[PDB]
Amino acid sequence: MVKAVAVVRGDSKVTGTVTFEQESESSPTIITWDITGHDPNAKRGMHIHTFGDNTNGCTSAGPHFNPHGKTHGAPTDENRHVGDLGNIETDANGNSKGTMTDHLVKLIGPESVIGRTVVVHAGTDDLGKGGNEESLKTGNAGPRPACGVIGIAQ
């Protein structure tokens, strides 16, 4: 029913598209990514950050979207940010195509991620198991080579 898309780019060669589909507010959101230009054979963090603000590049996206005030985790963790989409897997060409079904992310209602930002990170998300404050906030997934605002799609 509701469809959204982020076209990500940044101060890097990482580009691509992240789409979102959600039938109703209570339904899972299906998230597809199609990323190119990343490091090969890598695990790279991908998160929804709070602000769809690109005024100062991907930095103004702010932190991970966390309406429920949880610690950073894996998508499979109960204690995760809404925006915690884990690591995407890049192939030998630095590309990553994938789909996930997310049970926290909404396109509908007060916690909608429409208008927020998808960030593809430079590093691996430690999924909140890094044992430091930074892990519980960001997963230590490194800088932000590409981001894009989640917009309404046809």
Site string (58-77) toward a copy of itself, x via CB under 8 A: -xx-xx--xxxxxx-xxxxx
Q: Does 40 bind Na ion (CB under 5 A)?
A: no
User: Torsions phi, psi of 106, nearest 5?
Assistant: -125, 145
CB 141 to Cu ion: min, Å: 5
Collapse the DSSP code of 129 into the 3-class scheme (helix H, G, I; strand E, B; otherwise coil) and give the result: coil
**Of 2, 33, 46, 84, which one interacts with Zn ion (CB under 5 A)?**
84
**Residue number with CB closer to a copy of itself (38 or 80):** 80
Catalytic residue, candidates 44, 47, 80, 116: 47
- 49 catalytically annotated: yes
Q: Does 7 bind a copy of itself (CB under 8 A)?
A: yes
Q: Does 93 bind Na ion (CB under 5 A)?
A: no
The phi-psi region of residue 119 (left if phi > 0; otherwise alpha if psi is between -120 and 50; otherwise beta) is beta
**Residue 61 CB neighbours (<10 A):** 27
Catalytic residue, candidates 38, 49, 80, 116: 49
Show Cβ contacts of residue 130 under 8 Å, excluding neighbours closer than 6 positions.
136, 139, 140
